[PDB]
Amino acid sequence: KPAVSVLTMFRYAGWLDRLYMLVGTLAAIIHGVALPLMMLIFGDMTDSFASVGQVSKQSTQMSEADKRAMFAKLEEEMTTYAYYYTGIGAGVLIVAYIQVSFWCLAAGRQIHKIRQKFFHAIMNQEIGWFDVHDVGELNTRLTDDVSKINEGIGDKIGMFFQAMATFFGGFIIGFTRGWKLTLVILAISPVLGLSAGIWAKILSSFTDKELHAYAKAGAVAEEVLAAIRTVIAFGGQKKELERYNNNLEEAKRLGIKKAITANISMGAAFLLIYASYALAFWYGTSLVISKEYSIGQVLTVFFSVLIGAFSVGQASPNIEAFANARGAAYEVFKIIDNKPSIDSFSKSGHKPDNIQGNLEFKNIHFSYPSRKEVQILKGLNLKVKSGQTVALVGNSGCGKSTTVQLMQRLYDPLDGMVSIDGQDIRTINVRYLREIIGVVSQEPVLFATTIAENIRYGREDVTMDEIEKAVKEANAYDFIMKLPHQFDTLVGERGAQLSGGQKQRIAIARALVRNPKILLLDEATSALDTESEAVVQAALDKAREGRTTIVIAHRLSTVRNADVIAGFDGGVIVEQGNHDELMREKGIYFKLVMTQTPPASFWRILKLNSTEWPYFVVGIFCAIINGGLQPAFSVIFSKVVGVFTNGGPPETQRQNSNLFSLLFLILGIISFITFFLQGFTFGKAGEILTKRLRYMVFKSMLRQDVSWFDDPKNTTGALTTRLANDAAQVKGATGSRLAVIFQNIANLGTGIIISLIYGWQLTLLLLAIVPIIAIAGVVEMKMLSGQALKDKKELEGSGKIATEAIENFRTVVSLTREQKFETMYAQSLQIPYRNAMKKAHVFGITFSFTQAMMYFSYAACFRFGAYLVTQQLMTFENVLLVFSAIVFGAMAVGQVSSFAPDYAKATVSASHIIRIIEKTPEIDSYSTQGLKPNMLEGNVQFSGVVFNYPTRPSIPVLQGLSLEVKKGQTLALVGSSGCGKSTVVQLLERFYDPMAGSVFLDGKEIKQLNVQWLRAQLGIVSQEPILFDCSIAENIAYGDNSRVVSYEEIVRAAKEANIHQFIDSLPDKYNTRVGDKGTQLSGGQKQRIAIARALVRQPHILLLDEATSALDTESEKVVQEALDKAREGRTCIVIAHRLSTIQNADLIVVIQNGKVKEHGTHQQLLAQKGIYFSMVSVQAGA
């Protein structure tokens, strides 16, 4: 919404840039003008043949006489026009190059200046300006915005003025050569713009509908694939598939409806286009019979106006390009034009010498630009004498840090003054101030360069001698020497990750080269290991003694030797003096002292598609007839112009034009039928395989085992995404592109034969030209992408050192040396700049070549078509025929190159979708194998089990685990911590088989048992029960599948689970919708419902996994009450964390590091002492 004045935007264009734009925009206008002049000549040529065509047929008496005057006229005429054509080709060749080159030259030169100035501005902004602004957004704003500006001031403008020139140029020639047809053409203009208007309305509306449609099906999948371990446990995999099939069923019906309407629209649009196109010509013919116009003129005015009309459509996108560019240039220039109060690039202000380092802070009130929300410094008084060292102490706010912040004049104080020596800090030059102040910070930063270089960021002028003494006086010398490469080592975020205490010591070495008179040390010792702290501490102490120093830390070991200690409370200075005095004050200080002591052949996807043997043949057969249909229009138009051109005695003509204009319209309406057909057939074909695929994919996805689902690569979102993209992407490839590609090959193949058989060697020649300009047209786009990529790589490297410069910024300003970063940036950019010059040279040649080739190619059409071919009997009427036939056959092949990528993107998206079906599990619920025992009663035998999780085969959870629990009794399970407790419940459900060892239920091995039937007997109840959206009765009825449960059954279950209080209370009762689409309710109820699911199944085995985990107060009591009523009739394993409620259990078993450590009844473990007595002691006491 905010934008920029048109003249500001060019502020960096002067002299040449200005001139370049003018010569370019000039050349561009000439270029544009060229094309309608070309079409103007086309009417003159028509007239020349037309005269002879009228006289040739007027003879029917003499022959040899016509071999003279006719040929002579054509000779002088044709040679003239051809000469002019060649004349226009050289023109467009020159102006095209001028056009693109100059405008790109302007672009390059300005953007270079935009770029430099911008970064310079960024580095100049005061720190408060950063504190309010997102650095991330700013740098991404840098690279992305300047590119938009580039797109805006580029050759896009040249293209705009070219388009206007064609628009004006066309309409002028249209109007002058006649007023009538132009206004008749202007009359049909609003109709073609309206139909395209119906398109923007249909597309925008229906695009959301399909997205809205699958959003429903994809909502089924998302709650399922998130809830998977629940559907696997309860084996509802046939149900969730059925639901997904139902939603897919609806989505395809909506899809075919959309396919019907969308094809009707496109078909009707093409009718109106061909209708008006034919209508305009009919009025055109009606004016020729009246002898108002030349038949040749009609072609000139008709082509010129329509060309000039479409020029508006082709112009519009460049307006947008310019428009967007201004908007982008607003926020960039805003920073550039902004001027700071503090500068730091300004040469002004006193530069005192023999600074004695006498500091004072007078009555300073300050607030960081969180501003009025908080005031952290209320007044202040502090003096620090020359050569002394003062230590600041505080509980919170770190208002101490503020003074170190103000002392570098990062911020000017609200009221009061900071005074270095006698003078105010605001009188002295900022750069020099920062230079006479050294700084060492809690978190040290190293830029990526040699250690010599990071030490060279203290001062640009330095020698390895000064480096050496610096690190040595920082006692960083010995430790780095041991490091390989010596001072030439590397450092940064990337590579050479080092001890902090060493980094801090390089930082102290850097600050030391600065040889400052004032030293600020903030917490530098803090947040560091105790051993290396003393090492660095030695350095810090050796860094002072030449300098006055203010230091802040939480280490009171480093304070004692300070000549002055100063505490703050609420921004108010309170205590000052020597340590003993402060201890005698027994104040805040004493308080703190005491406190601290890919492409391949995948046919089979098409084989899957072969379920429709028909519908393809219909669409194909239909499209090939539409292929043969398309050039018929080119054949008519040839003979409409042709017979009228070829007419001879006129009396017959006017009747014929009517017949043609009629037939001209007939291919129009027959096209509606054929286009709607092929589109609808493929469309339905697309939606049905969209079902089969998403079905077979989802289905195969339910098959896989928890091993696959625990994977990091596959998370619920990634699967839904994988599920949508692949199905959609194969559809396009089996879809329209194939319909269209076949339409086109038939289009050209029909066009070629007609052209071939009519012209001998007419056509043969043309076919030599077009593929060459087509390939020449493809290779340009290839170079274009190449240069684009290379430029991206070069500015990526410059933008990288930019990001470095502004991400660490608050440090670089503290050291100054922003000019170093200005210069580094400059040199970085100088390569794309030289690259950007070459770019213009190339863009101009390729463009001009492609245009000149098309214009020169045209000359050959008539030169060889006349002369050598028309000297012979072979005739004009067909020359016009072939012209359209081949050229529009080629323009149709152009769609091949356009639809190339959709195939790849579909094949890659296919490459995944074939594999995802054929991947097979270790454990598949689908196999009907397994024993299906007849005997009810469950035991559970765990013997010598070892388990390591497939995702994390590092720390094993289970090592030699052995448990036994008899039927109809409760096995309590205790543990130090972890899934050791819970993994039991997972293995019995057989989400995994163990590495070694085995587990038995009735004494049979589950490993050889039926996976489905096994789970069918289990009473699983987790921490946070997921309930699908549906009737709460349907959530309960999930406890049993392959059968529908009775109302009185799910009643008995709810009665059992004590959830019935709610369920009679609600308006809907059992049909209430839950899952926080229909309704929301707390955990206590959700759990009780899960309890109902569980004992709806009537399991012989209940598994209660940390059931009361998330819960509170009475809810725990009533849920526990329900769980307790749920067991004692059944085998169960309860891993719950309430050991007060485990006190009644048949067998309690302490698990330790995978091995059962203790086991027994409660009092039995109570009699002993060990882990379990401790477990029960701590929490009952806490």
User: Exposed/middle/buried for 676, CB within 10 Å: 0-12, 13-18, 19+?
Assistant: buried
Taking CB atoms within 8 Å and a gap of at least 24, the contacts of 618-623 are: 618/677, 618/681, 619/677, 619/678, 619/681, 619/682, 619/685, 619/739, 620/678, 620/742, 622/674, 622/677, 622/678, 622/681, 623/674, 623/678, 623/739, 623/740, 623/742, 623/743, 623/746
Select from 1016, 1063, 1023 the least CA-distant residue to 1042.
1016
Phi and psi at residue 721, in whole multiples of 5°? -60, -50
| C-alpha span between 910 and 926 (Å, rounded) | 25
Angle (CA) 573-579-581 rounded to 5° is: 80
Of the candidates 497, 554, 493, the residue with the CA atom closest to the CA atom of residue 521: 554
Closest CA to 411 of 360, 354, 501, 342: 342
CA separation for the pair 449, 597 (Å, rounded): 42
Residue 424, amino acid: D
The annotated binding site for ATP is made up of: 394-401, 975-982
DSSP 1044: P
- CB within 8 A of 864, min separation 6: which ones? 762, 765
What is the C-alpha to C-alpha distance for residues 576 and 383, in angstroms, rounded to an integer? 10
Experimental structure resolution, Å: 3.4
Query: Distance (Å, rounded) from C-alpha 729 to C-alpha 1038?
Result: 35
Distance from the first to the final alpha carbon of the chain: 61
Contact status, residue 924 vs residue 1010, Cβ threshold 8 Å: no
Instruction: For the beta carbon of residue 586, count every other beta carbon within 10 angstroms.
Output: 10
Residue pair 121/298 in contact by the 8 Å Cβ criterion: no
- CB-based contact 215:250 (threshold 8 Å): no
CA distance 217 to 908: 24
Polymer length in residues for the chain? 1182
Q: After which residues is the chain broken (C to N over 2.5 A)?
A: 597
DSSP secondary structure string for all residues of 658-681: HHHHHHHHHHHHHHHHHHHHHHHH
- Residue 911, judged by CB atoms within 10 A of its CB (0-12, 13-18, 19+), counts as middle
Closest C-alpha to 437, from 425, 452, 427: 425
Q: Name the residue among 751, 390, 353, 410 with its Cα closest to residue 561.
A: 390
Residues 6+ apart with CB under 8 A from 1101: 938, 940, 988, 1001, 1017, 1018, 1019, 1130, 1131, 1132, 1133
Instruction: Write down all domains in the chain, each with its CATH number in brackets.
Output: 1-348+598-929 (1.20.1560.10), 349-597 (3.40.50.300), 930-1182 (3.40.50.300)
- Burial of 756: CB neighbours in 10 Å, binned 0-12, 13-18, 19+: middle
Determine whether 372 is exposed, middle or buried from the number of CB atoms within 10 Å of its CB (0-12, 13-18, 19+).
exposed
Dihedral sign, CA of 160, 161, 165, 168? positive
Binding-site residues from annotation = 394-401, 975-982
> What is the three-class DSSP state of 988?
helix
Show the tokens assigned to 732: 């396009």
Report, in angstroms and rounded to the nearest whole number, the Rg of the chain calculated over CA atoms: 43
